[PDB]
Amino acid sequence: AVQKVVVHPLVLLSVVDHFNRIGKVGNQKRVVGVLLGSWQKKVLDVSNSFAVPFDEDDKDDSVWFLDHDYLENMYGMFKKVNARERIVGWYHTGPKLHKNDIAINELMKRYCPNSVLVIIDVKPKDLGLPTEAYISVEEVHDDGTPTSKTFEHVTSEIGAEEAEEVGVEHLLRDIKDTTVGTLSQRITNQVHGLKGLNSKLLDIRSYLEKVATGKLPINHQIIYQLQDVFNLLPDVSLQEFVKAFYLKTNDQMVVVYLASLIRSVVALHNLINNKIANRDAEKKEG
Amino acid sequence: AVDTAEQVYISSLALLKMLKHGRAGVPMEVMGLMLGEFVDDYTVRVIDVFAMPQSGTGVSVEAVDPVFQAKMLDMLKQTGRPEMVVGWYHSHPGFGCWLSGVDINTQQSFEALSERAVAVVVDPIQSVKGKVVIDAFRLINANMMVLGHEPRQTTSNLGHLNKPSIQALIHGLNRHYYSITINYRKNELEQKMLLNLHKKSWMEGLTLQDYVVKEMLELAKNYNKAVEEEDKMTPEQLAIKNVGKQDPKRHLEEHVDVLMTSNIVQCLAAMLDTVVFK
Amino acid sequence: TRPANHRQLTFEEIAKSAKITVNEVELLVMKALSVGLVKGSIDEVDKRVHMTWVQPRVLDLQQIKGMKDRLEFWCTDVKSMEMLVEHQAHDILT
Amino acid sequence: TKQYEKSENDLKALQSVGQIVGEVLKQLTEEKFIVKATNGPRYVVGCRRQLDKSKLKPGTRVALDMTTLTIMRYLPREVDPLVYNMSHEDPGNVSYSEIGGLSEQIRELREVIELPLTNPELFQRVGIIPPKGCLLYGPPGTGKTLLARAVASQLDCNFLKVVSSSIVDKYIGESARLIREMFNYARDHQPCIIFMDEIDAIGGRRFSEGTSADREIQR
Amino acid sequence: LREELQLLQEQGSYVGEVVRAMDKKKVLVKVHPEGKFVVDVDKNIDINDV
Amino acid sequence: THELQAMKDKIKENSEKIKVNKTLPYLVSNVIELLDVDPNDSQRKGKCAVIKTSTRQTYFLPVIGLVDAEKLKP
Amino acid sequence: EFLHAQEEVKRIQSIPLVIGQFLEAVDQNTAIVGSTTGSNYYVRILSTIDRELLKPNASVALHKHSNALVDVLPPEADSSIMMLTSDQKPDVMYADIGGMDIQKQEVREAVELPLTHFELYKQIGIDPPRGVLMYGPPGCGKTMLAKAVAHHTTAAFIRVVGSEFVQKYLGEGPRMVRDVFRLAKENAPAIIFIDEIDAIATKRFDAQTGADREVQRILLELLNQMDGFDQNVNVKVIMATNRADTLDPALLRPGRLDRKIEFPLPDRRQKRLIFSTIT
Ligand SMILES: Nc1ncnc2c1ncn2[C@@H]1O[C@H](COP(=O)(O)OP(=O)(O)OP(=O)(O)O)[C@@H](O)[C@H]1O
Ligand SMILES: Nc1ncnc2c1ncn2[C@@H]1O[C@H](COP(=O)(O)OP(=O)(O)OP(=O)(O)O)[C@@H](O)[C@H]1O
Ligand SMILES: [Zn+2]
């Protein structure tokens, strides 16, 4: 079915520009619309969409309505201009999901066998690659609950297209690209420890909270399982590198050797040729 | 009577369907419609752009369905903003995006409907990322040849847009037409996330993910050694000697600075041992 | 249970815990290779059984406390020296 | 009932423009391929992500996109005239042996033509090769065509008929590749049989050197 | 080179063959696969080299 | 049972959309009938026939649409 | 910003591109290039590499609309059709003439030494010719000694009929025979075999035969290209024809083809030898 989704900045903006539409008139809830997907393969892609007036009451927390006269005839519009573009699901800006979201997908399953919902974010904050994606399946449960319909997270990734980077990538103009090979990889390293070890502390504090409160989630078992896959090397005191010690510097063996060999001859190219051309102009002029 | 140079405020949402709907018609030319509000004579804004059915038999003035707009405006009422129509646009991917013979026939028809009806063209081909490309024009009336034929006041917004002058046939259409200035009213809220969504997705996906060892340096040493002798024969070729050969010639680049950065790639990637671990 | 490694294991330790004779340690640890709990090949010169990967099972209250000891220890050690990478090398970047 | 709307949705697929065929030559790199359209221009273009490893090939006919000129899916070939050469039929067996003469000539192309298919092992074991060609002239009597014609479809339903009218073609005749095309589709039939009739026209002799029409005959 | 390429961008630029020269400054142009052309001035290099 | 006349109106209305596509059958194209299936790489099945053009160019288009493959040999 | 400008010029034109044929370098910053369609185009060269990969005659990629000069071939991707195919084996053993040693001594000096040898030539000063012309059939001869050389030595064999390069346009013709002879000087050792070029040797001025006369000037073009092999590296040109009466005098003239090898009429000698090989 649906494994991963591809969200373009163009269709994501179609949720963002509608945040100006109903944001000025208010009032409650969020921006919600129906998603037009482009499915060429198991990997899902999204090009365009259409935003529909939508509201969700608080009291009355289970009340939701799409406008389906907007959904029907406007489909024949986008279908007439683009035959490949069809509705794969819906979307909204979240930020989180209330329990009522179970009924939005099951209603529109007449349009698509499986409707994928995309939670987006109009204001970028944290922690990383934004928005979100969910898929609607039924896993029931191990405890014996009646059949449980819970949306499972779908990994979301941004993607590009021809001719769409004209105006999009133009307006920024302030970015330095990249530079690959010097700063590009090292800034990630400073962040790889930051973003790597912050979720380490956020989860290890919530995993300690388990014993305290919030149990379940037990989880189970996914938590410790892949944590023990992380445990191929801990790495703890001290590094257990006795076999990887001589191999540590042995990987730095040729990297330092070439860096010593290149800088020697690069100098011979830089130093000699500079002295030659310099004294040819300098002393022959005066 | 009084005519002042117009300034076009385009919304980042209206910029989407210009290139996107134009990409769907590639290679063939499409016909769209511009949506916006007329503030005054010297400024104009396009707040929305929508897609219109592409013509596989060629663009015509009847390609726009009036019941398509009448059903669209009604759907814009239940949508947040029901703004009145303004003008039209069309893609021209196959060439340098100039107004064709059909574009002038649909001018007097659209300029009768709406006052301005700015003619807007767009092309995918001229660039990819860092150029505005697109196009825009506005019909100056040929009946005005009896009157003064050189609008507009506040000139160089035209005059500067009259640069580069874009070859000949394009500005050959400057007879009976005059282009219009396109500036971006700030969407920067969306434009700030446009940079954040683009670069974060391009930074190692987590920034973590991405962060032929000696052999890649054995393949590099062929570029770091076997390339040296073909590079270091040139200073012996600079020795004539002396001097019958035409000079100067500079062979210093680009291999020297490439092997520099080649070590910059290999040194900081080897620092991943010291960086990631401890 | 242990942080290891301490990966390769001596046969006498298996002959202690599992209390199996030296001639039967082969069938023992190699059958686990087919079960899939450990892929580690066996070193038969010193007769020491080497381990690879691991099989996690369930969890205990002392396992979470044992986790925070040896898990966050990777977080506090790396980020401490990661600041050293940020400190000194921020001048050459700017 | 609803099958009509299905054909209406097929018209939406008819809105897609057709791509342009081309012949690949070789490859400079994985990102640069050299393709040549049937019209004769060559294009170094990029490729899209939906293709497979079978697209590369050693110069196999492919189709090029209408914009990026990238290869989508390769079509093997196309031939209009082939069907008119598919319909040739002759009887016998018996009707071939009923011609009354010459008696030994019926015993000739019987084992020469029809036999290789039913019993190829007889020739390869002894080591004798069957003849790769034959010539039947006349008319001291009749039977120049019929002798080879009846054994032509007696081998199998396989046959390919060639008329001398297709060789002359037109001014700057392109049938040079059609003689290759006609024989290409002759190999689509196995085992193949090739006819040539009335070669005294298209067999033009170079003894006395004439107009270049005699040269293109040799071509 | 970017600005100059825009001059050469549309059709590229061709190479002609002049069969005869005129004093009116119009020079006949001929491309090998195409037909003969002619154009008005067109004066760049000294005319004596043409 | 009367729904047959309801859909009969929309097929004639959409046949009028074919009329503007039927004016005019602008050019001659040599036909070659072909049947092939392409595994991907979900499954896409269909009949597609390689087409010619008398301009000496050759193109690739799905099987027509309108008149089916019943007529004729290429 | 200048390093960002380096990404600019490298961005242009990206894809797509079209092949074109370089003609000559007229001056700096620009050069003329013949299009694949045959129309010569005068294009500003790219500011990166103006010299080493230019070359007098080469196939250079051009942009679709702008036809911009960017990069040439390695060289080369070569061309269509194919080579080799003579390595299947067995054909004919050379031991038949092994008893003479008077015939092989002249053959041994005319085959393997002209293939690869260097210091022996400049010493004596004799410049070995590339010319091999085979006339005299019937009988067949010829291709027997062709695949027999394949037993002797191993080299790339270019096998094309004299009519193989005849096409509907006259712009592709000069490029094919150029791509055939430019791989001969590029790769060594190389042997090119064309069968019966006496066809295109027919001289007719008529416009409908203009392309037919265009391929005989192509024959005179590759004739101009065969002196580009002089000297000395590299090529081996073997020529075979059934009737040489239609050939031009300058084609058989020395300085290009200096050796005429006349295959003798079968007569009495080839009788008994040819009955033994079939039995
Ligand atoms: N022995 C025969 N038995 C039956 N019919 C025959 C016989 N010989 C000839 N025919 C008839 O004569 C017709 C022509 O036959 P065939 O091809 O042998 O002669 P042909 O080649 O046309 O004459 P020519 O050799 O002068 O060109 C056939 O249609 C066939 O029906
Ligand atoms: N021992 C032999 N002596 C003479 N000819 C032979 C011998 N063995 C094979 N051949 C013939 O040589 C032919 C191949 O020669 P090639 O391909 O050069 O054409 P060709 O004989 O030159 O054609 P043409 O005779 O019309 O010029 C084969 O058809 C084969 O029958
Ligand atoms: Zn138009």
Side-chain angles (χ1 to χ4, degrees):
Chain A
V2 180
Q3 180 176 354
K4 59 181 180 298
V5 300
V6 174
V7 178
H8 299 171
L10 274 59
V11 62
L12 197 149
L13 198 163
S14 180
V15 200
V16 177
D17 65 350
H18 194 274
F19 191 83
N20 187 26
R21 295 298 184 89
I22 57 101
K24 53 190 173 182
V25 76
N27 285 325
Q28 203 62 53
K29 198 194 59 73
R30 66 184 65 84
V31 174
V32 171
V34 186
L35 190 72
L36 286 164
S38 180
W39 177 277
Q40 196 60 55
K41 194 57 179 175
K42 177 175 54 59
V43 50
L44 193 147
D45 186 13
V46 179
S47 300
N48 200 342
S49 290
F50 53 98
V52 58
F54 183 94
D55 279 326
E56 177 267 343
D57 304 335
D58 54 343
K59 294 293 187 294
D60 295 325
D61 60 343
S62 298
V63 183
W64 72 271
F65 296 104
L66 296 174
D67 184 16
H68 299 84
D69 190 18
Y70 187 88
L71 203 159
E72 284 301 323
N73 299 134
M74 183 166 282
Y75 185 80
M77 298 179 176
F78 294 145
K79 183 63 173 175
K80 180 178 68 175
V81 56
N82 193 335
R84 186 59 59 183
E85 193 73 12
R86 64 185 180 275
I87 26 89
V88 83
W90 59 292
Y91 57 84
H92 62 285
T93 196
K96 293 292 178 288
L97 64 94
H98 46 277
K99 189 179 181 180
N100 182 32
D101 293 344
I102 181 177
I104 287 91
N105 195 326
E106 291 301 311
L107 173 142
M108 68 178 73
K109 294 187 68 63
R110 56 179 177 182
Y111 300 99
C112 183
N114 49 338
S115 300
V116 48
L117 74 89
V118 177
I119 293 180
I120 69 105
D121 192 8
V122 294
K123 301 173 296 298
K125 294 172 297 301
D126 280 325
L127 190 64
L129 190 150
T131 70
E132 205 273 346
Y134 281 116
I135 185 62
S136 178
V137 302
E138 297 81 5
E139 74 283 357
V140 198
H141 201 269
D142 191 17
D143 194 19
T145 70
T147 298
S148 179
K149 194 180 305 295
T150 300
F151 302 98
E152 303 302 323
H153 176 63
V154 170
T155 171
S156 179
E157 64 178 345
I158 312 298
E161 177 68 17
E162 284 299 325
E164 77 174 348
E165 296 181 352
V166 177
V168 171
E169 294 183 350
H170 158 64
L171 293 179
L172 38 97
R173 185 64 67 181
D174 191 74
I175 193 61
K176 175 181 171 60
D177 48 342
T178 302
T179 49
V180 178
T182 157
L183 55 86
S184 181
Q185 68 282 356
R186 54 161 297 180
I187 285 134
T188 64
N189 303 338
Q190 306 180 341
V191 180
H192 106 284
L194 192 148
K195 288 297 188 301
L197 299 178
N198 59 22
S199 179
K200 188 89 160 181
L201 191 145
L202 265 61
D203 280 341
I204 200 169
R205 191 60 59 183
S206 63
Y207 297 152
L208 174 66
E209 182 273 342
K210 298 300 180 296
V211 176
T213 54
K215 203 74 165 294
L216 278 66
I218 169 74
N219 203 345
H220 213 242
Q221 73 287 357
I222 180 63
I223 296 303
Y224 73 94
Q225 182 179 358
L226 199 141
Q227 172 190 353
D228 205 10
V229 180
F230 170 84
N231 205 0
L232 266 58
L233 44 90
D235 267 324
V236 294
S237 69
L238 287 66
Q239 314 314 323
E240 296 91 9
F241 271 169
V242 180
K243 286 294 176 289
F245 267 152
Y246 65 92
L247 186 145
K248 170 68 169 62
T249 315
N250 210 341
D251 285 337
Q252 202 64 250
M253 174 89 162
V254 186
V255 181
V256 171
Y257 280 163
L258 279 202
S260 63
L261 265 54
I262 282 118
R263 294 291 185 268
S264 64
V265 188
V266 162
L268 193 136
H269 283 75
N270 288 337
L271 299 175
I272 300 304
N273 295 280
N274 193 336
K275 296 170 181 62
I276 294 177
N278 184 28
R279 60 196 171 191
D280 284 339
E282 176 269 335
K283 78 153 301 179
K284 298 301 290 184
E285 182 178 1
Chain B
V2 45
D3 294 334
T4 314
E6 303 81 359
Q7 186 63 69
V8 180
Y9 304 136
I10 75 105
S11 63
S12 180
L13 75 101
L15 177 142
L16 304 184
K17 278 72 182 179
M18 290 300 301
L19 39 79
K20 180 171 67 183
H21 162 54
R23 177 58 179 167
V26 170
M28 200 167 185
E29 62 278 2
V30 317
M31 166 60 69
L33 290 174
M34 176 176 69
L35 183 56
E37 182 271 347
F38 289 152
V39 45
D40 50 22
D41 186 76
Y42 51 87
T43 49
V44 54
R45 64 164 55 193
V46 38
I47 202 161
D48 187 15
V49 169
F50 46 91
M52 292 296 295
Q54 297 120 6
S55 297
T57 326
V59 169
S60 63
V61 68
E62 293 84 1
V64 172
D65 195 9
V67 296
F68 188 93
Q69 291 301 107
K71 191 183 296 295
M72 182 64 179
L73 295 174
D74 188 16
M75 287 177 175
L76 291 174
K77 299 177 182 66
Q78 51 197 14
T79 319
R81 184 184 60 255
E83 70 277 16
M84 178 63 180
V85 296
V86 281
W88 64 287
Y89 71 93
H90 68 291
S91 299
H92 269 163
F95 46 86
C97 63
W98 44 266
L99 298 169
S100 62
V102 178
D103 299 337
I104 184 171
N105 291 280
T106 189
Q107 264 300 102
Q108 75 266 351
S109 302
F110 279 156
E111 76 178 349
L113 173 62
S114 182
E115 177 181 1
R116 294 175 182 80
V118 174
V120 179
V121 209
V122 62
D123 171 78
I125 307 302
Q126 299 303 324
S127 73
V128 47
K129 49 177 180 179
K131 184 179 176 180
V132 296
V133 198
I134 200 172
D135 189 13
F137 275 103
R138 176 62 179 88
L139 181 79
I140 184 62
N141 293 334
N143 306 128
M144 293 180 63
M145 63 180 291
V146 179
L147 198 63
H149 223 87
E150 291 84 0
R152 288 280 203 269
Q153 290 76 354
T154 79
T155 300
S156 289
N157 71 341
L158 270 59
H160 298 168
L161 179 67
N162 191 31
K163 313 294 184 178
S165 176
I166 187 65
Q167 296 311 103
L169 190 147
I170 318 298
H171 97 274
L173 301 176
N174 192 29
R175 175 193 59 194
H176 305 164
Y177 286 98
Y178 71 95
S179 186
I180 203 169
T181 68
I182 301 103
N183 68 335
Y184 305 88
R185 62 181 185 90
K186 294 308 292 180
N187 294 123
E188 209 282 334
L189 185 145
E190 178 276 331
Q191 186 56 237
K192 180 182 60 61
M193 73 182 294
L194 186 150
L195 191 149
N196 186 24
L197 271 58
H198 184 273
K199 307 307 175 182
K200 172 57 188 174
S201 180
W202 282 18
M203 195 85 156
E204 324 309 319
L206 229 166
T207 64
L208 276 71
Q209 286 180 336
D210 294 347
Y211 315 98
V212 204
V213 173
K214 305 183 187 303
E215 281 74 8
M216 79 170 290
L217 301 175
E218 290 174 351
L219 297 174
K221 79 189 177 190
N222 298 333
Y223 308 140
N224 302 328
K225 297 175 178 66
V227 173
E228 286 185 353
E229 70 258 6
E230 67 182 348
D231 290 339
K232 73 196 182 69
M233 279 294 104
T234 49
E236 286 191 349
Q237 292 175 340
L238 293 176
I240 308 305
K241 152 96 179 171
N242 206 49
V243 39
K245 182 61 169 59
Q246 182 177 355
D247 293 337
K249 181 60 173 61
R250 179 172 177 267
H251 294 281
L252 281 71
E253 293 303 323
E254 305 84 355
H255 291 285
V256 169
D257 293 345
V258 166
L259 306 188
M260 288 296 296
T261 59
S262 179
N263 282 340
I264 301 175
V265 178
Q266 83 186 33
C267 69
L268 293 177
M271 289 294 292
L272 292 179
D273 305 351
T274 60
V275 170
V276 174
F277 153 74
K278 295 297 285 184
Chain C
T1 302
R2 307 180 308 173
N5 304 272
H6 294 165
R7 212 173 186 87
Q8 185 176 1
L9 303 171
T10 177
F11 63 97
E12 186 176 0
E13 189 275 340
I14 292 99
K16 185 186 300 177
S17 299
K19 61 184 63 181
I20 192 61
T21 181
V22 182
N23 295 281
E24 284 298 326
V25 303
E26 296 78 342
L27 297 80
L28 197 149
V29 297
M30 299 188 301
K31 183 61 177 175
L33 304 176
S34 60
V35 176
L37 59 93
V38 63
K39 290 182 293 293
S41 64
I42 301 96
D43 189 19
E44 297 189 359
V45 47
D46 294 341
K47 300 182 295 183
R48 305 176 184 273
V49 180
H50 176 62
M51 298 280 94
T52 63
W53 187 60
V54 63
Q55 187 64 255
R57 292 302 176 198
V58 207
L59 196 67
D60 283 329
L61 193 146
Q62 62 177 14
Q63 295 295 325
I64 294 113
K65 298 307 292 179
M67 168 189 73
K68 294 185 64 65
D69 292 341
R70 305 185 182 279
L71 197 69
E72 192 274 337
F73 206 68
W74 169 262
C75 174
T76 183
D77 287 341
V78 173
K79 187 176 176 62
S80 60
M81 287 187 179
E82 190 69 22
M83 298 300 297
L84 293 182
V85 178
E86 302 180 359
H87 176 272
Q88 185 61 258
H90 188 275
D91 300 340
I92 51 181
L93 179 142
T94 304
Chain D
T1 300
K2 295 176 178 178
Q3 299 178 336
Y4 295 96
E5 186 68 19
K6 177 183 177 182
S7 62
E8 298 301 319
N9 299 338
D10 296 341
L11 193 149
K12 303 295 185 295
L14 295 173
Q15 301 296 101
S16 177
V17 298
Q19 288 182 330
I20 175 64
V21 307
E23 286 83 356
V24 186
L25 307 183
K26 285 186 180 67
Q27 60 174 18
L28 199 153
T29 324
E30 299 299 325
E31 297 180 353
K32 295 179 179 179
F33 296 158
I34 302 187
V35 298
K36 178 175 68 180
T38 56
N39 305 129
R42 298 176 180 174
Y43 300 96
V44 275
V45 298
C47 288
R48 61 179 300 176
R49 300 177 181 87
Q50 81 171 22
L51 48 91
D52 294 336
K53 61 183 179 298
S54 301
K55 179 201 74 62
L56 307 181
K57 288 293 190 296
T60 301
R61 176 182 294 269
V62 298
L64 302 176
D65 191 14
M66 298 302 295
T67 305
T68 310
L69 310 174
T70 170
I71 297 96
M72 176 180 290
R73 287 177 291 104
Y74 57 95
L75 56 97
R77 265 151 298 184
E78 65 280 357
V79 51
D80 193 354
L82 174 59
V83 181
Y84 297 143
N85 306 127
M86 295 290 296
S87 300
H88 192 72
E89 80 290 358
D90 294 306
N93 291 132
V94 178
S95 67
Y96 172 63
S97 180
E98 282 183 346
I99 64 178
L102 212 161
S103 298
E104 64 183 345
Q105 301 175 352
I106 299 168
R107 199 163 178 261
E108 161 64 13
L109 290 190
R110 178 61 59 190
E111 310 166 4
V112 158
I113 292 177
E114 188 274 335
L115 181 56
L117 174 61
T118 174
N119 286 327
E121 188 273 341
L122 309 183
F123 301 153
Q124 62 180 19
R125 177 183 178 274
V126 183
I128 188 56
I129 189 72
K132 53 188 177 300
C134 177
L135 173 68
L136 302 182
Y137 59 92
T142 180
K144 55 158 61 180
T145 304
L146 284 176
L147 200 145
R149 216 188 70 198
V151 201
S153 63
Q154 185 39 237
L155 177 63
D156 196 51
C157 57
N158 180 339
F159 182 62
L160 181 132
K161 182 60 175 59
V162 180
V163 186
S164 58
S165 63
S166 179
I167 289 89
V168 270
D169 190 350
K170 204 68 172 181
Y171 60 96
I172 307 103
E174 294 80 359
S175 284
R177 68 186 172 93
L178 176 61
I179 301 304
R180 299 197 296 262
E181 180 181 5
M182 177 176 62
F183 288 163
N184 172 33
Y185 292 106
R187 295 176 174 81
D188 174 75
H189 309 85
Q190 299 83 358
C192 175
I193 296 180
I194 298 172
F195 265 10
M196 287 187 62
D197 180 67
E198 203 262 335
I199 201 179
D200 51 342
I202 53 173
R205 184 173 186 88
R206 62 183 297 176
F207 172 78
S208 178
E209 193 277 337
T211 76
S212 306
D214 172 72
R215 172 189 165 277
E216 61 185 343
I217 280 174
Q218 298 297 329
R219 295 192 302 105
Chain E
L1 183 140
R2 274 290 298 167
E3 181 65 19
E4 182 68 16
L5 178 66
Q6 299 303 322
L7 274 62
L8 207 129
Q9 176 59 249
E10 297 299 325
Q11 303 180 344
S13 298
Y14 308 154
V15 178
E17 296 296 325
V18 48
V19 302
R20 189 178 179 177
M22 290 280 96
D23 56 343
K24 65 189 300 178
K25 299 169 66 181
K26 287 183 63 64
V27 179
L28 199 154
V29 180
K30 180 183 173 60
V31 189
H32 314 281
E34 302 300 324
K36 302 181 180 68
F37 303 149
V38 62
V39 70
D40 307 345
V41 37
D42 189 21
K43 62 185 188 65
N44 289 273
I45 321 297
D46 293 339
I47 304 175
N48 63 339
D49 301 341
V50 180
Chain F
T1 62
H2 303 291
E3 296 180 351
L4 296 177
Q5 301 300 106
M7 186 168 288
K8 192 65 181 297
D9 297 341
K10 68 175 63 179
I11 62 102
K12 292 179 178 179
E13 179 68 20
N14 222 41
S15 295
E16 188 275 336
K17 190 184 65 59
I18 305 175
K19 293 181 180 179
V20 299
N21 293 331
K22 286 177 63 179
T23 164
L24 307 162
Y26 286 134
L27 69 99
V28 174
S29 182
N30 185 326
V31 188
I32 290 91
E33 180 69 17
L34 180 62
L35 174 59
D36 188 13
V37 58
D38 49 340
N40 297 130
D41 296 338
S42 298
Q43 294 294 106
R44 296 179 295 179
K45 298 183 298 299
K47 191 187 294 180
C48 190
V50 179
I51 222 66
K52 295 287 290 182
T53 46
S54 301
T55 190
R56 302 295 182 183
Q57 301 168 336
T58 301
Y59 296 93
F60 188 70
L61 48 78
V63 166
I64 55 174
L66 179 61
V67 287
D68 298 341
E70 60 183 345
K71 55 185 186 67
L72 199 63
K73 60 184 179 298
Chain G
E1 296 176 357
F2 182 80
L3 295 176
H4 180 280
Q6 292 299 324
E7 296 298 324
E8 293 296 327
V9 292
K10 294 303 293 181
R11 178 185 70 87
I12 285 93
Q13 58 276 356
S14 178
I15 50 96
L17 294 84
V18 58
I19 284 95
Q21 174 185 352
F22 191 86
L23 182 55
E24 70 181 345
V26 291
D27 58 344
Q28 186 58 253
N29 296 128
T30 173
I32 57 179
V33 43
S35 62
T36 308
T37 63
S39 294
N40 303 358
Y41 295 163
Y42 163 84
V43 179
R44 286 293 305 263
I45 71 180
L46 215 159
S47 180
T48 52
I49 291 93
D50 302 339
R51 291 171 178 82
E52 56 272 12
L53 56 82
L54 182 138
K55 297 302 294 183
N57 290 333
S59 179
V60 51
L62 305 180
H63 174 254
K64 179 59 173 61
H65 300 278
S66 62
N67 303 329
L69 291 164
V70 174
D71 186 15
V72 299
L73 297 181
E76 199 188 13
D78 292 340
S79 177
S80 60
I81 317 107
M82 71 193 300
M83 57 189 73
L84 270 61
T85 63
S86 65
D87 299 341
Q88 54 174 17
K89 315 301 182 179
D91 183 23
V92 169
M93 183 57 66
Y94 62 93
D96 298 338
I97 56 175
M100 300 297 180
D101 279 343
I102 52 175
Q103 184 177 355
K104 295 205 306 183
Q105 183 54 61
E106 184 69 15
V107 172
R108 194 64 62 90
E109 294 173 349
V111 175
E112 69 173 357
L113 278 76
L115 187 70
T116 165
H117 205 174
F118 203 80
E119 69 282 359
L120 178 58
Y121 281 140
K122 302 304 179 186
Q123 285 186 329
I124 58 177
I126 291 93
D127 294 339
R130 67 187 53 83
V132 175
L133 176 62
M134 292 179 285
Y135 179 66
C140 298
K142 285 184 283 180
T143 309
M144 281 200 297
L145 307 179
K147 299 173 179 177
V149 167
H151 299 285
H152 295 57
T153 58
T154 57
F157 295 103
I158 291 292
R159 51 175 63 229
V160 287
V161 190
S163 180
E164 112 285 9
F165 67 95
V166 177
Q167 296 300 323
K168 60 183 178 181
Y169 288 147
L170 46 81
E172 180 62 24
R175 291 181 176 86
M176 287 180 290
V177 297
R178 178 172 294 101
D179 295 341
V180 173
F181 275 180
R182 73 188 298 178
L183 56 84
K185 63 180 70 177
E186 173 270 340
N187 183 30
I191 296 176
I192 298 174
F193 174 79
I194 315 171
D195 190 15
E196 293 181 353
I197 68 169
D198 56 342
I200 63 178
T202 302
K203 44 188 181 299
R204 189 61 178 171
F205 164 79
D206 298 336
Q208 294 79 359
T209 61
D212 166 46
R213 192 173 178 88
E214 192 274 335
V215 299
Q216 93 171 29
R217 304 192 315 280
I218 283 175
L219 175 60
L220 193 144
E221 177 175 1
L222 62 90
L223 191 73
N224 199 344
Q225 299 176 340
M226 75 177 290
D227 269 350
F229 303 142
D230 277 336
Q231 296 183 345
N232 202 347
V233 42
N234 193 34
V235 79
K236 286 295 184 63
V237 174
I238 51 177
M239 186 180 296
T241 177
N242 59 342
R243 290 189 62 177
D245 51 344
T246 56
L247 294 179
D248 295 342
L251 303 175
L252 286 71
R253 164 194 44 76
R256 294 184 175 278
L257 308 180
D258 308 6
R259 302 292 184 269
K260 298 175 180 176
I261 298 174
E262 295 299 323
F263 179 78
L265 197 65
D267 294 337
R268 185 57 63 188
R269 286 294 177 265
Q270 276 74 348
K271 296 292 188 177
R272 305 167 187 173
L273 295 177
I274 220 151
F275 286 103
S276 64
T277 182
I278 184 58
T279 190

